[PDB]
Write an enzyme that holds these catalytic residues in place. Sequence first.
Site, short mmCIF file in Angstrom:
data_model
loop_
_atom_site.label_atom_id
_atom_site.label_comp_id
_atom_site.label_asym_id
_atom_site.label_seq_id
_atom_site.Cartn_x
_atom_site.Cartn_y
_atom_site.Cartn_z
N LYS A 45 -6.17 -6.32 -4.37
CA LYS A 45 -5.57 -5.10 -3.82
C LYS A 45 -5.02 -4.15 -4.88
O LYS A 45 -4.26 -3.24 -4.55
CB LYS A 45 -4.44 -5.43 -2.82
N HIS A 98 -10.96 -12.40 -9.70
CA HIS A 98 -9.53 -12.29 -9.41
C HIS A 98 -8.82 -13.48 -10.02
O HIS A 98 -7.60 -13.62 -9.91
CB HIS A 98 -9.25 -12.27 -7.91
N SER A 128 -0.67 -3.09 0.62
CA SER A 128 -2.12 -3.12 0.79
C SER A 128 -2.57 -4.50 1.25
O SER A 128 -3.41 -4.63 2.13
CB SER A 128 -2.82 -2.75 -0.51
#
Length: 284
Positions: A45, A98, A128
């Site tokens: 995000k 990630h 988010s």
Amino acid sequence: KLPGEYFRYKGVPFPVGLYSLESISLAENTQDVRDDDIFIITYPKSGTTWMIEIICLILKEGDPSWIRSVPIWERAPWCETIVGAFSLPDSPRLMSSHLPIQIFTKAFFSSKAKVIYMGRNPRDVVVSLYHYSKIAGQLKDPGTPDQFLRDFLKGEVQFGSWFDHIKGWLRMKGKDNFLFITYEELQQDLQGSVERICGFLGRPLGKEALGSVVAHSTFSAMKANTMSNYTLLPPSLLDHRRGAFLRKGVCGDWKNHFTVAQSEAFDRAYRKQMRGMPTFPWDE
Ligand SMILES: Nc1ncnc2c1ncn2[C@@H]1O[C@H](COP(=O)(O)O)[C@@H](OP(=O)(O)O)[C@H]1O
Ligand code: NA
């Protein structure tokens, strides 16, 4: 087939279904890292999508053709997902991850491959992530904003602690094959940021291609691009009926999400965790 649960790998939380001990482990141990390979690493995000579209536009020197016809997730495949970029034949390879530095592809450290790490205001990341969890099938419901916030502060979310994440990756600052940039820098001067990334990648652009990369990189242009806005995803994986991946695309939405009390508890957490860290754009 998504439960909306987490399993752990080396102590870090991963969404069941899209990840597995194998997919992660493969990403961690593969020896397949190339000198012109390009990696985009972020805590979820923080604007991964934004970065992916920008580099796809740079690689094609501004020609929107590729981003118009191929889904964003196929242009910069995830290394750790069940269907990882490593588990595919496809150079110049553009990949996304990630994973926190202590799990990311180890072979990378002794390679010449490039990495762009992108950071965003953790508060905005919280918002988010909060909204996204409601429409994301692999993620369980956020719960109350307040309980979600506690989870986020304890690192009880996909990929673990945001603090650990950015602190670990900043350990690469200084290597010439590592660029650190922020969502705030892109929001403030997209063109300036694009030129800066072009330099980093050894990929100069004429005033034309440049203006084009900037035009198709804008939030509105992107929300309008089918291949880039995740609307081609199965409703079971992303409920389009209930929301959009590209939600607001601004800075500061956190101030509409955090109560003053929450905002003060977060600052305490932040203050302890980031003791020796340098100043970031979002540090007001
Ligand atoms: N071109 C763009 N400009 C601004 N924000 C963008 C963007 N493309 C994606 N984003 C934002 O990045 C977030 C998604 O992050 P990621 O791709 O890493 O999962 C969303 O934030 P918001 O939910 O605040 O709107 C999304 O709108
Ligand atoms: Na969900």
